[PDB]
Amino acid sequence: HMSTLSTHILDISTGTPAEGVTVSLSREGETLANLVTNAQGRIATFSAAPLPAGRYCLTAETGAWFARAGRESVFTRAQIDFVIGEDHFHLPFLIAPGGWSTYRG
Amino acid sequence: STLSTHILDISTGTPAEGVTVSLSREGETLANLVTNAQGRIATFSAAPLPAGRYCLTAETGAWFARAGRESVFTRAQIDFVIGDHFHLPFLIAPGGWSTYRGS
Amino acid sequence: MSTLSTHILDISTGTPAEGVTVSLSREGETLANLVTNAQGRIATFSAAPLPAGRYCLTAETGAWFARAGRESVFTRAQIDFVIGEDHFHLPFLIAPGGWSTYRGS
Amino acid sequence: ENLYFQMSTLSTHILDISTGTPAEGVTVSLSREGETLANLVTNAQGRIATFSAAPLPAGRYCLTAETGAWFARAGRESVFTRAQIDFVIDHFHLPFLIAPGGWSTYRGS
Numbered sequence: 263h264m265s266t267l268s269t270h271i272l273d274i275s276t277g278t279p280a281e282g283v284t285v286s287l288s289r290e291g292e293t294l295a296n297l298v299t300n301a302q303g304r305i306a307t308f309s310a311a312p313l314p315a316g317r318y319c320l321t322a323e324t325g326a327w328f329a330r331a332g333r334e335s336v337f338t339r340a341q342i343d344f345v346i347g348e349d350h351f352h353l354p355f356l357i358a359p360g361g362w363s364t365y366r367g
Numbered sequence: 368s369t370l371s372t373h374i375l376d377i378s379t380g381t382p383a384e385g386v387t388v389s390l391s392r393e394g395e396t397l398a399n400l401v402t403n404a405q406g407r408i409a410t411f412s413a414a415p416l417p418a419g420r421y422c423l424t425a426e427t428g429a430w431f432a433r434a435g436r437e438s439v440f441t442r443a444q445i446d447f448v449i450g451d452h453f454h455l456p457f458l459i460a461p462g463g464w465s466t467y468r469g470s
Numbered sequence: 471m472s473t474l475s476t477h478i479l480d481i482s483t484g485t486p487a488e489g490v491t492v493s494l495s496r497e498g499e500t501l502a503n504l505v506t507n508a509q510g511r512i513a514t515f516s517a518a519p520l521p522a523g524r525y526c527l528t529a530e531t532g533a534w535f536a537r538a539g540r541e542s543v544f545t546r547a548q549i550d551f552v553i554g555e556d557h558f559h560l561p562f563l564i565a566p567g568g569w570s571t572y573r574g575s
Numbered sequence: 576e577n578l579y580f581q582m583s584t585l586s587t588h589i590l591d592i593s594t595g596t597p598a599e600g601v602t603v604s605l606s607r608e609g610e611t612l613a614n615l616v617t618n619a620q621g622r623i624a625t626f627s628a629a630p631l632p633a634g635r636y637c638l639t640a641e642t643g644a645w646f647a648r649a650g651r652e653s654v655f656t657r658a659q660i661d662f663v664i665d666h667f668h669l670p671f672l673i674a675p676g677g678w679s680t681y682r683g684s
Contacts, residue, residue, distance in 0.1 A: 270575075275378035277439060277462025277573035302575055317656060325663075336380055336662050336682050338635060343656045345643075351654070356572055358460050360380025361681025363570075363672075365563055366484035366654055380682035405684075420545060428552075439551045439558070439573055441524060446545045448532075453543070458570075458681060465679075467568025467672060468543050468595035470588075470620055482593035484654060484676025543595055565674050567595025 264312035268352045270367070271303045271322060275358040279303025282330075283355075284323040289316050315347020322355045324362065335359040370411045370453045373469070374402050374425060378460040382406025385433075387426040392419050418449050425457050427464065436461055471519035474558045477574070478510040478529060482565035486510025489537075490562075491530040496523050522553050529562045531569065542566040576602070580613035582630035585667045588683070589621045589640060593674040597621025600648075601671075602641040607634055633664050640671050642678065651675055 267287065271280040280303045287295040287308045295308045325338040340355050340362050352367030370390065374383040383406045390398040390411045398411045411423075428441040438461040445455055445466050454469040474494065478487040487510045494502040494515045502515040515527075532545040547562050547569050559574040585605065589598040598621045605613040605626045613626040626638075643656040653675040660669055660680050668684035 272462070272572060272574060274460045274463035274572045279575045325661075336667075337680075338661045338663050341659045341661060343643075343659060344654045345656050346654075356463065356679075358377045358380075360375070360460075361377040361458065361679065363677065363679030364655075365479060365481050365677025367479065375681060375683060377681045382684070428550075439554075440571075441550045441552050444548050444550060446532075446548060447543050448545050463570065463572030465568065465570030465672075466544075467590060467592045469590060470597045479676070481674045481677040484674075563677065565592045565676075567590070568592040568672070 263347050264314050265346050265349055265351050266312050267308045267318075267320070268350070268367075269299075269305050269320065269322075270352070270354040271299050271324075272354070272356050273303075273358065274356050275360075280327065280355075280357060283327045286319075286321045286323075288319045288321070289313075312349070313346055317343070317345050319343055320353055322357070324355070324357050328359055333359055337362060340364075368416050368449050368451055368453055370416060370421075370423075370455070372402075372408050372411075372423065372425075372454070373456040374406045375456065375458050376406075376460065377458050378462075383430065383457075383459060386430045389422075389424045389426075391422045391424070416449055421447055421449060423447070423455060425459070427457070427459050431461055438462070440464060471521060472553050472555060472558050473519055474515040474525075474527070474560070476506075476512050476515075476527065476529075476559070477561040478506050479561070479563050480510075480565065481563050482567075487534065487562075487564060490534045493528050493530075495526045495528070496520075520553055524550070524552050526550050527560060529564070531562070531564050535566055540566055544569060547571075576604075576614050578614055578616060580605075580615060580626055581628040582632065583664050583667050584630050585626045585636075585638070585669070587617075587623050587638065587640075587668070588670040589617050590670070590672050591621075591674065592672050593676075598645065598671075598673060601645045604639045604641075606637045606639070631664060635661070635663050637661050638669060640673070642671070642673050646675055 273280045283299045320342040322340045328335045376383045386402040424444040458465040480487045527549040529547045591598045601617045638660045640658040
């Protein structure tokens with residue numbers, strides 16, 4: 263099968279959506295998209311067409327985002343490794359300087 | 368059974384020292400203890416705990432308040448059942464919290 | 471004054487939790503008793519905005535797991551929060567062996 | 576792959592929160608700048624006590640837990656293929672809380 267993809271990043275250290283986080287989508291090491299979360303911490307779509315079956319990586323540049331805000335983190339970035347092939351994947355990042363998580367939304 | 372906890376402030380990546388945690392069973396309090404420098408409470412009862420419904424409540428809102436940090440969560444209450452050892456950590460932050468059965 | 475919503479996802483299976491009972495109370499007085507829909511959601515807990523105060527949102531997760539033939543050490547999931555924004559979205563990410571919440575958006 | 580290893584030490588603990596039990600037999604690798612430094616397996620308590628004989632130097636590291644393969648061996652499907660933590664360097668304890676439908680990490684200890 264094939265599915266569309268979205269994400270949402272929340273900074274749970276402050277309880278606010280994370281605006282301005284760069285998030286990249288790659289497949290077999292080739293970048294497909296490099297986008298930025300909006301004021302609601304969201305990226306509504308990574309592609310016009312559903313993504314074909316395959317192995318994907320969604321990487322949020324969380325370390326750089328914390329650093330621009332003058333904040334330290336042990337985690338340098340947040341990478342989600344997933345497989346496609348359900349019409350939609352929503353894969354949020356819940357982030358903090360001291361930890362992070364994801365789930366199938 | 369025996370009961371322990373561990374509280375980690377994931378907003379800073381450090382153990383949460385000085386958090387008050389209360390144990391109760393059917394509304395009656397069994398223990399009131401404070402996390403140590405490692406964020407831990409090794410045991411809530413000198414005697415082993417019988418089967419029943421229990422509540423562990425960490426005073427997280429008050430803990431963040433003491434550090435001058437705002438949170439919409441006022442406290443963190445876990446509701447669990449003893450039908451072994453139960454290790455029930457709290458992972459806390461001003462904007463969210465988690466628990467799980469650890470080991 | 472603010473409105474309140476929730477979303478319950480069973481992360482043990484990666485699916486929205488349909489049919490979980492969720493109640494809202496304030497000072498022991500119950501204000502709502504609702505059930506999550508097919509998307510694991512409850513869009514509002516009140517007809518009018520909730521006044522400032524301390525609230526308790528309780529999802530009957532243990533009962534929900536039990537109806538499906540599944541055991542959990544957690545009997546229910548209770549979120550205690552305070553209304554001092556426009557909206558509070560307070561999800562439950564649940565599993566037989568653990569659960570979490572966060573201030574969403 | 577072979578099991579192997581050999582200033583801050585590194586440990587992990589993997590819990591399957593879908594069942595509330597330690598995850599035994601999960602392969603976890605440590606790498607730095609492309610080079611894999613260690614490849615180990617969680618014990619009955621879901622733990623790997625150390626990824627190195629001596630404490631690790633400063634730098635950027637990647638701990639990767641083969642969670643998808645572990646779930647698949649138990650006949651359980653997941654959209655997550657593995658769990659990679661990217662971090663920087665006293666002790667680093669970096670647990671994985673895993674489930675077929677989501678996972679998390681944090682700095683423990």
